[PDB]
């Protein structure tokens, strides 16, 4: 698991003034690596398909209530013509 | 002054990972042209649209008990 590197180590001392050819070192933490713990990404069990099932069941349940309300409100036009026509005839009797 | 060791950043420095035999046969790398995750987003938005349409319809239909009173009372007092 060691990355390949031909060269071991080299040395020409670090005078703060004489910095030339500005490269950048690999910045590392001071803590032992063992707690830089492992990669884990876990799925939500509710799947893109499962939410489809749940929301479709909800849509189909709501459609029944919408149809119930429509059929409750679809009888009012029958009520108007069932209630007012006899009243119009009674007025006509005069 | 300061001291440290050094490792030369040569272009020959490569890295060799290991892949599992079933690594590339994942349900995530292999995606169809149409998934259900988008269908969830559409269906939730449609349900939320219907929710507000329900309140609009309720405020529209709240006048049904109101429209009947003022069409009958001025004729009731007319007869009486």
Curated annotation (Swiss-Prot), chain A:
Bilayer-spanning residue ranges: none
Cell compartment(s), UniProt: Virion; Host nucleus
Region Interaction with major capsid protein/MCP, residue ranges: 1-49, 1-50
Function: Capsid vertex-specific component that plays a role during viral DNA encapsidation, assuring correct genome cleavage and presumably stabilizing capsids that contain full-length viral genomes. Participates in the interaction between the capsid and the tegument through interaction with the large tegument protein/LTP. May mediate the capsid docking to the nuclear pore allowing entry of the viral genome into the host nucleus through binding to host nucleoporins NUP214.
Family classification: Belongs to the herpesviridae CVC2 protein family.
Subunit structure: Heterodimerizes with CVC1. Interacts with major capsid protein/MCP and triplex capsid protein 1/TRX1 at the pentamer vertices. Interacts with the large tegument protein/LTP. Interacts with host NUP214; this interaction might be essential to the capsid docking to the host nuclear pore. Interacts with host TMEM250.
Name the record gives this protein: Capsid vertex component 2
Highest classification ranks of the organism: Viruses, Duplodnaviria, Heunggongvirae, Peploviricota, Herviviricetes
């Amino acid at each position: 698991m060691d990355p390949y590197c031909p060269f071991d180590a080299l040395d020409v001392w670090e005078h703060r003034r004489f910095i030339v050819a500005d490269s950048r070192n690999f910045i590392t933490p001071e803590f032992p690596r063992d707690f830089w713990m492992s990669p884990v990404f876990n799925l939500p069990r509710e799947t893109a398909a499962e939410q489809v099932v749940v929301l479709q069941a909800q849509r189909t349940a709501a459609a029944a209530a919408l149809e119930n309300a429509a059929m409750q409100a679809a009888e009012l036009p029958v009520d108007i013509e069932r209630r007012l026509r006899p009243i119009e005839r009674n007025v006509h009797e005069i």
